[PDB]
Amino acid sequence: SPCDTNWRYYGDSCYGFFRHNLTWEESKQYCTDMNATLLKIDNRNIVEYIKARTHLIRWVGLSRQKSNEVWKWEDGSVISENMFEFLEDGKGNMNCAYFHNGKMHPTFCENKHYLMCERKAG
């Protein structure tokens, strides 16, 4: 495969799963330290791939800059309309999302969870 050891190739991306129990911001930093980014999930096929590759709660790259604002990926794009089916209930001041077993869940950014990162395949 085109991805380094501890990374997995799917579509056009390399995905890494890291059992570091960190806040969302700490997880962002962890990915940055590996020249990577928190995951973007932009279709059902990637939802299915990720849940087939991990069954622990892990942060993804979906967040809002402030309470009650729109949900965006790290690349600054708002979550696609098709992807709302995969975003579960939350409160207005839950501003970061994790992924677990096929669903994204809003929660408090200061909570600790494992993470995953993404790099473009080359």
PDB file of C-alpha atoms in Angstrom:
ATOM      1  CA  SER A   1       0.000   0.000   0.000  1.00  0.00           C
ATOM      2  CA  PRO A   2       0.884   3.711  -0.409  1.00  0.00           C
ATOM      3  CA  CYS A   3       0.430   4.453   3.314  1.00  0.00           C
ATOM      4  CA  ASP A   4       3.089   4.166   6.035  1.00  0.00           C
ATOM      5  CA  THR A   5       2.975   1.529   8.762  1.00  0.00           C
ATOM      6  CA  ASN A   6       0.072   2.149  11.196  1.00  0.00           C
ATOM      7  CA  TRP A   7      -1.898   3.889   8.419  1.00  0.00           C
ATOM      8  CA  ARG A   8      -4.540   2.380   6.155  1.00  0.00           C
ATOM      9  CA  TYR A   9      -5.356   3.189   2.541  1.00  0.00           C
ATOM     10  CA  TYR A  10      -8.884   3.907   1.362  1.00  0.00           C
ATOM     11  CA  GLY A  11     -10.105   5.972  -1.573  1.00  0.00           C
ATOM     12  CA  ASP A  12      -7.470   8.671  -1.911  1.00  0.00           C
ATOM     13  CA  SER A  13      -6.503   8.899   1.780  1.00  0.00           C
ATOM     14  CA  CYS A  14      -4.313   7.347   4.429  1.00  0.00           C
ATOM     15  CA  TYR A  15      -6.009   6.874   7.801  1.00  0.00           C
ATOM     16  CA  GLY A  16      -4.303   6.464  11.180  1.00  0.00           C
ATOM     17  CA  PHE A  17      -5.984   5.313  14.384  1.00  0.00           C
ATOM     18  CA  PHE A  18      -4.303   6.384  17.589  1.00  0.00           C
ATOM     19  CA  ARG A  19      -5.198   5.295  21.122  1.00  0.00           C
ATOM     20  CA  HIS A  20      -4.239   8.524  22.799  1.00  0.00           C
ATOM     21  CA  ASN A  21      -6.955   9.720  25.165  1.00  0.00           C
ATOM     22  CA  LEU A  22      -6.979  13.460  24.503  1.00  0.00           C
ATOM     23  CA  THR A  23      -9.226  16.515  24.272  1.00  0.00           C
ATOM     24  CA  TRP A  24     -10.373  17.565  20.803  1.00  0.00           C
ATOM     25  CA  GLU A  25      -7.775  20.369  20.617  1.00  0.00           C
ATOM     26  CA  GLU A  26      -5.054  18.010  21.895  1.00  0.00           C
ATOM     27  CA  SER A  27      -6.113  15.501  19.236  1.00  0.00           C
ATOM     28  CA  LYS A  28      -5.878  18.189  16.541  1.00  0.00           C
ATOM     29  CA  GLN A  29      -2.354  18.883  17.791  1.00  0.00           C
ATOM     30  CA  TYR A  30      -1.524  15.183  17.749  1.00  0.00           C
ATOM     31  CA  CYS A  31      -2.494  14.967  14.069  1.00  0.00           C
ATOM     32  CA  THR A  32      -0.554  18.184  13.311  1.00  0.00           C
ATOM     33  CA  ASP A  33       2.536  16.586  14.889  1.00  0.00           C
ATOM     34  CA  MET A  34       2.256  13.820  12.278  1.00  0.00           C
ATOM     35  CA  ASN A  35       1.705  16.223   9.365  1.00  0.00           C
ATOM     36  CA  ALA A  36      -1.923  15.101   9.284  1.00  0.00           C
ATOM     37  CA  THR A  37      -5.446  16.344  10.034  1.00  0.00           C
ATOM     38  CA  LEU A  38      -8.419  15.070  12.018  1.00  0.00           C
ATOM     39  CA  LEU A  39     -10.696  12.949   9.801  1.00  0.00           C
ATOM     40  CA  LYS A  40     -13.242  14.228   7.304  1.00  0.00           C
ATOM     41  CA  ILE A  41     -16.155  11.864   6.606  1.00  0.00           C
ATOM     42  CA  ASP A  42     -17.992  12.986   3.481  1.00  0.00           C
ATOM     43  CA  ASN A  43     -20.002   9.961   2.421  1.00  0.00           C
ATOM     44  CA  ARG A  44     -21.662   6.759   3.611  1.00  0.00           C
ATOM     45  CA  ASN A  45     -18.915   4.592   2.145  1.00  0.00           C
ATOM     46  CA  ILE A  46     -16.297   6.277   4.356  1.00  0.00           C
ATOM     47  CA  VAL A  47     -18.648   5.959   7.379  1.00  0.00           C
ATOM     48  CA  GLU A  48     -18.784   2.210   6.683  1.00  0.00           C
ATOM     49  CA  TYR A  49     -15.040   1.939   6.140  1.00  0.00           C
ATOM     50  CA  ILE A  50     -14.157   3.676   9.389  1.00  0.00           C
ATOM     51  CA  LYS A  51     -16.611   1.631  11.459  1.00  0.00           C
ATOM     52  CA  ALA A  52     -15.101  -1.530   9.905  1.00  0.00           C
ATOM     53  CA  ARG A  53     -11.637  -0.364  11.023  1.00  0.00           C
ATOM     54  CA  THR A  54     -12.376   0.766  14.592  1.00  0.00           C
ATOM     55  CA  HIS A  55     -15.074   0.201  17.201  1.00  0.00           C
ATOM     56  CA  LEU A  56     -13.861   2.613  19.875  1.00  0.00           C
ATOM     57  CA  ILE A  57     -15.060   6.206  20.254  1.00  0.00           C
ATOM     58  CA  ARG A  58     -12.667   8.518  18.358  1.00  0.00           C
ATOM     59  CA  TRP A  59     -12.653  12.228  17.655  1.00  0.00           C
ATOM     60  CA  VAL A  60     -13.195  13.367  14.076  1.00  0.00           C
ATOM     61  CA  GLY A  61     -12.468  16.761  12.495  1.00  0.00           C
ATOM     62  CA  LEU A  62     -16.024  18.161  12.818  1.00  0.00           C
ATOM     63  CA  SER A  63     -16.439  21.202  15.054  1.00  0.00           C
ATOM     64  CA  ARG A  64     -18.083  24.592  15.354  1.00  0.00           C
ATOM     65  CA  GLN A  65     -16.067  27.632  16.355  1.00  0.00           C
ATOM     66  CA  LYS A  66     -18.637  28.709  18.949  1.00  0.00           C
ATOM     67  CA  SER A  67     -21.805  27.351  20.523  1.00  0.00           C
ATOM     68  CA  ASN A  68     -24.870  27.242  18.269  1.00  0.00           C
ATOM     69  CA  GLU A  69     -22.905  27.802  15.039  1.00  0.00           C
ATOM     70  CA  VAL A  70     -22.723  25.524  11.964  1.00  0.00           C
ATOM     71  CA  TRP A  71     -20.677  22.307  11.900  1.00  0.00           C
ATOM     72  CA  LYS A  72     -17.535  22.386   9.771  1.00  0.00           C
ATOM     73  CA  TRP A  73     -14.665  20.084   8.907  1.00  0.00           C
ATOM     74  CA  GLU A  74     -11.030  21.047   9.435  1.00  0.00           C
ATOM     75  CA  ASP A  75     -10.853  22.187   5.793  1.00  0.00           C
ATOM     76  CA  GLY A  76     -13.480  24.810   6.626  1.00  0.00           C
ATOM     77  CA  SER A  77     -16.288  23.197   4.621  1.00  0.00           C
ATOM     78  CA  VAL A  78     -19.728  22.966   6.240  1.00  0.00           C
ATOM     79  CA  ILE A  79     -20.950  19.367   6.710  1.00  0.00           C
ATOM     80  CA  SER A  80     -22.658  18.216   3.470  1.00  0.00           C
ATOM     81  CA  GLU A  81     -26.439  17.994   3.519  1.00  0.00           C
ATOM     82  CA  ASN A  82     -26.206  14.229   2.788  1.00  0.00           C
ATOM     83  CA  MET A  83     -24.159  13.798   5.956  1.00  0.00           C
ATOM     84  CA  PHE A  84     -26.748  15.148   8.413  1.00  0.00           C
ATOM     85  CA  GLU A  85     -28.258  11.634   8.526  1.00  0.00           C
ATOM     86  CA  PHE A  86     -25.040  10.599  10.305  1.00  0.00           C
ATOM     87  CA  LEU A  87     -24.952  13.414  12.865  1.00  0.00           C
ATOM     88  CA  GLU A  88     -26.745  12.498  16.083  1.00  0.00           C
ATOM     89  CA  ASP A  89     -28.414  14.703  18.743  1.00  0.00           C
ATOM     90  CA  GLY A  90     -26.541  17.201  20.867  1.00  0.00           C
ATOM     91  CA  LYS A  91     -26.815  20.440  22.811  1.00  0.00           C
ATOM     92  CA  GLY A  92     -25.961  23.892  21.441  1.00  0.00           C
ATOM     93  CA  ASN A  93     -22.710  24.193  23.396  1.00  0.00           C
ATOM     94  CA  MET A  94     -21.364  20.808  22.400  1.00  0.00           C
ATOM     95  CA  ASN A  95     -18.925  22.043  19.767  1.00  0.00           C
ATOM     96  CA  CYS A  96     -16.825  18.993  18.733  1.00  0.00           C
ATOM     97  CA  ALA A  97     -17.897  15.592  17.364  1.00  0.00           C
ATOM     98  CA  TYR A  98     -16.644  12.049  17.784  1.00  0.00           C
ATOM     99  CA  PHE A  99     -17.401   9.029  15.596  1.00  0.00           C
ATOM    100  CA  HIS A 100     -18.545   5.685  16.936  1.00  0.00           C
ATOM    101  CA  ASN A 101     -19.831   2.653  15.062  1.00  0.00           C
ATOM    102  CA  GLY A 102     -21.252   4.572  12.099  1.00  0.00           C
ATOM    103  CA  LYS A 103     -22.522   7.758  13.756  1.00  0.00           C
ATOM    104  CA  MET A 104     -21.074  11.138  14.693  1.00  0.00           C
ATOM    105  CA  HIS A 105     -22.008  12.571  18.071  1.00  0.00           C
ATOM    106  CA  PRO A 106     -21.617  16.140  19.289  1.00  0.00           C
ATOM    107  CA  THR A 107     -20.016  16.418  22.707  1.00  0.00           C
ATOM    108  CA  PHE A 108     -17.969  18.800  24.852  1.00  0.00           C
ATOM    109  CA  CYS A 109     -14.585  19.586  23.314  1.00  0.00           C
ATOM    110  CA  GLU A 110     -12.823  19.246  26.725  1.00  0.00           C
ATOM    111  CA  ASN A 111     -13.830  15.592  27.073  1.00  0.00           C
ATOM    112  CA  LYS A 112     -11.169  12.964  26.448  1.00  0.00           C
ATOM    113  CA  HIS A 113     -11.343  10.423  23.629  1.00  0.00           C
ATOM    114  CA  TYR A 114      -9.085   8.452  21.305  1.00  0.00           C
ATOM    115  CA  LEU A 115      -8.545   9.879  17.842  1.00  0.00           C
ATOM    116  CA  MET A 116      -7.861   9.298  14.201  1.00  0.00           C
ATOM    117  CA  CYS A 117      -5.956  11.268  11.553  1.00  0.00           C
ATOM    118  CA  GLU A 118      -5.972  11.559   7.758  1.00  0.00           C
ATOM    119  CA  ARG A 119      -3.297  12.369   5.105  1.00  0.00           C
ATOM    120  CA  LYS A 120      -3.672  12.453   1.294  1.00  0.00           C
ATOM    121  CA  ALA A 121      -2.246   9.298  -0.267  1.00  0.00           C
ATOM    122  CA  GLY A 122       0.858   9.741  -2.431  1.00  0.00           C
TER     123      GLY A 122
END
